[PDB]
Amino acid sequence: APAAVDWREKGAVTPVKDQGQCGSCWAFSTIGNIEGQWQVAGNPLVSLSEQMLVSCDTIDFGCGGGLMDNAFNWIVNSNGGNVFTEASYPYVSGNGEQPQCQMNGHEIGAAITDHVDLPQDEDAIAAYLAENGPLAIAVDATSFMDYNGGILTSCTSEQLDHGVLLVGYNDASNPPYWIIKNSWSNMWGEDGYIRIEKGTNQCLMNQAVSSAVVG
Ligand SMILES: *[C@H](CS(=O)(=O)c1ccccc1)[C@H](CCc1ccccc1)NC(=O)[C@H](Cc1ccccc1)NC(=O)N1CCOCC1
Numbered sequence: 001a002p003a004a005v006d007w008r009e010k011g012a013v014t015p016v017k018d019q020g021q022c023g024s025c026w027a028f029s030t031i032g033n034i035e036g037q038w039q040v041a042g043n044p045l046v047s048l049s050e051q052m053l054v055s056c057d058t059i060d061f062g063c064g065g066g067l068m069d070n071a072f073n074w075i076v077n078s079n080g081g082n083v084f085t086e087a088s089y090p091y092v093s094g095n096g097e098q099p100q101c102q103m104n105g106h107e108i109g110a111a112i113t114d115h116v117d118l119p120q121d122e123d124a125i126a127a128y129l130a131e132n133g134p135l136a137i138a139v140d141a142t143s144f145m146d147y148n149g150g151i152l153t154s155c156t157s158e159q160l161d162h163g164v165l166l167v168g169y170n171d172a173s174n175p176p177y178w179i180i181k182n183s184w185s186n187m188w189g190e191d192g193y194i195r196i197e198k199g200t201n202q203c204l205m206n207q208a209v210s211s212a213v214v215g
Pocket residue numbers: 022023024025026063064065066067068138141142160161162163208
């Protein structure tokens with residue numbers, strides 16, 4: 001594994017989004033991972049549709065919550081592997097509205113075939129990230145609620161309750177850190193991102209790391 005990687009610099013990460021007043025973090029985590037896997041496979045970066053998941057994934061609960069594992073399963077087993085573009089199916093649940101599922105002639109932005117789980121092992125996660133692109137992860141978000149910048153070192157690490165996107169790390173820092181894309185707009189945190197220390201399982205970040213498989 002290299003000393004640092006930042007997939008934003010490598011072209012695999014779309015702008016920061018805003019889930020709004022909807023518990024759809026799990027959909028943003030899933031979609032962010034697919035956006036990265038699709039780009040790393042050699043396709044142009046394209047923003048994909050969280051709304052598709054919020055409205056159409058019948059395993060998960062829309063704004064009531066969900067799991068990235070379920071969302072990847074729904075895409076593959078119920079939507080033919082297809083993921084619609086954000087342009088085709090824009091996000092409208094930010095004020096809590098939850099319209100019926102559309103499905104119908106939507107532009108297909110990406111396709112996946114499966115998903116994989118990573119071990120609860122920060123070194124293995126870093127190596128896989130560096131080779132393969134941004135990863136869906138779960139965290140305890142308790143300490144995110146009052147984040148105002150810098151690197152967390154004493155994150156509350158009690159119970160997973162939020163899905164986010166792991167986009168990089170930097171070991172050449174006191175302390176080493178992960179770089180995480182949140183879905184609370186670009187006004188939150190460090191332009192929508194948070195850094196947490198790497199190597200002390202901050203916020204339970206190692207516990208539920210996954211990635212879609214393209215091709
Ligand atoms: C998204 C997290 S958040 O940013 O909205 C948030 C909210 C409150 C505290 C901390 C973070 C989402 C919020 C769900 C919600 C809905 C209404 C009111 C309050 C909270 N969280 C989830 O969807 C979590 C994500 C998760 C992913 C992977 C592992 C563990 C958790 N999942 C979740 O709540 N469930 C999935 C399983 O079934 C029931 C609930």
